[PDB]
Amino acid sequence: AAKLTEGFSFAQLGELYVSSALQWHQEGNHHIETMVKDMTG
Amino acid sequence: KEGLFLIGTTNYPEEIDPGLMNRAGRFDRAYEIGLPDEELRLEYMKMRGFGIFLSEGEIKN
Amino acid sequence: IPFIYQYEEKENERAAAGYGTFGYLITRIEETLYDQYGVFYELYASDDPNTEYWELLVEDVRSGSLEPEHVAYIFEKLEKKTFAYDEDEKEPDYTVHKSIRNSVYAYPEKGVAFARIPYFQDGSIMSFDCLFAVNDEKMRAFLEGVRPRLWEKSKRKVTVFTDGDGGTSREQEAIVREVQRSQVIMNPLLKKEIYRSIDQFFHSDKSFYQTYDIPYKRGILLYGPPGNGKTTLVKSIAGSIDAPVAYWQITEFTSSETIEEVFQAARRLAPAVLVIEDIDSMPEDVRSFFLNTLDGATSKEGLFLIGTTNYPEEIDPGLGRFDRAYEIGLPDEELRLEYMKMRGFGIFLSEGEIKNAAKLTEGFSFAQLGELYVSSALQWHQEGNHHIETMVKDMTG
């Protein structure tokens, strides 16, 4: 995830954390690769 | 300790400070409240009371 | 555990400053009310900050009403008489009557009594306003009655709010001219429509609003090209309504603060019509806040707002946040003709001459028909001759 987050601000890595946290806490599933690719686009 | 839930309103989303948006703190989701479609207009007219003086067909019309 | 101050007070040093005079006056006011009415009045406000019903008291005394009875003077050698005359008001009142300060008054049927107790300090003469009642139920009924009395009294008046640097200035004015509905010169179809709201809001039973579940408020915008007499029209509409009328004069001092003052003061006269002329003159930094007072989450009821603008563009950017916006154009032939009979052309013209003059005044504003009237009047009053056809043709050119 460090490798895929090129061009990411610290804030964006933070917003990634909160959004990735719910999913793991909601769906038992984090889906970071899906979420980094969706947050870039 | 323990939680403010903020709700902001605007008729002019263009004049919004963009810093407000898509952060978990500050406003993390925005929703558009748009003109009602026909099904919703018909729903509004019924609860509002148009049925007092309008027939079921006059309201549909 | 030790105490620094060990001085032991004479019992004479326990006395409360000012209480010996005040408690003595209150006791005597109560003894005197008992002697005259046979009941016991109790203090309910020792220096009442409320002014509304204290102003009703003064107007009651001033106008010779039977209801408030003069019970006693407080100090033998302070004033027993006063007069309404204040040189700062527009309309002087020369009424002379018994003083309010230095007096005790009672509304004996109401069970409520008033004493304005004088005292000396820095260096003027001031007073404690003291309110008495025979029991809690009468006190409450008296308070509940204040607003309906103020309402009836303000039907008979027009209240102007002029925004200033400190705040808004309230000014009551006599209804020197009453206005019948037949004197509202206006497009008949739209006159009919507006008066449906007005008659329901002011001249009917209020049950309509509860039956259809309809907020009890309204706001209409009257717009059109300049000189179309919008202002004279709104005053004419306002004058046809059997309810207090309040005019709000936007100035360069209008802020979100004066707005709230004016609306809270009008809302005390609810139901009332609130006239707002040239709402386009208000500063652009309060306009967002202003439109919220009419439709926001905490907007209130009881007011029928009527505004006028020449720039509908700038007031209600959604043009829509007023309930309805009506265009007032220049008068067509029949309106021009109603105008001429109401303004008094029939003084010096035959009916044929009026009909004709209505016909020749195409494109005339109401103001221009007015300026025609004054100029045509002199001639008939100066030369025995009116020469309207000559004067309309000369005023167009």
Swiss-Prot record, chain C:
Pfam families: AAA. GO terms for cellular component: cytoplasm. SUPFAM superfamilies: P-loop containing nucleoside triphosphate hydrolases. The keyword Methyltransferase does not apply. Transmembrane segments: none annotated. InterPro entries: AAA+_ATPase (IPR003593), AAA_ATPase_domain (IPR050168), ATPase_AAA_core (IPR003959), P-loop_NTPase (IPR027417). Induction: Expression is sigma W-dependent. Induced by alkali stress. Strongly induced at the end of the exponential growth phase. Its EC number is 3.-.-.-. It comes from the Bacteria. CDD domains: RecA-like_protease. It is found in: Cytoplasm. Belongs to the AAA ATPase family. This is Uncharacterized ATPase YjoB. It comes from Bacillus subtilis (strain 168). The gene is yjoB.
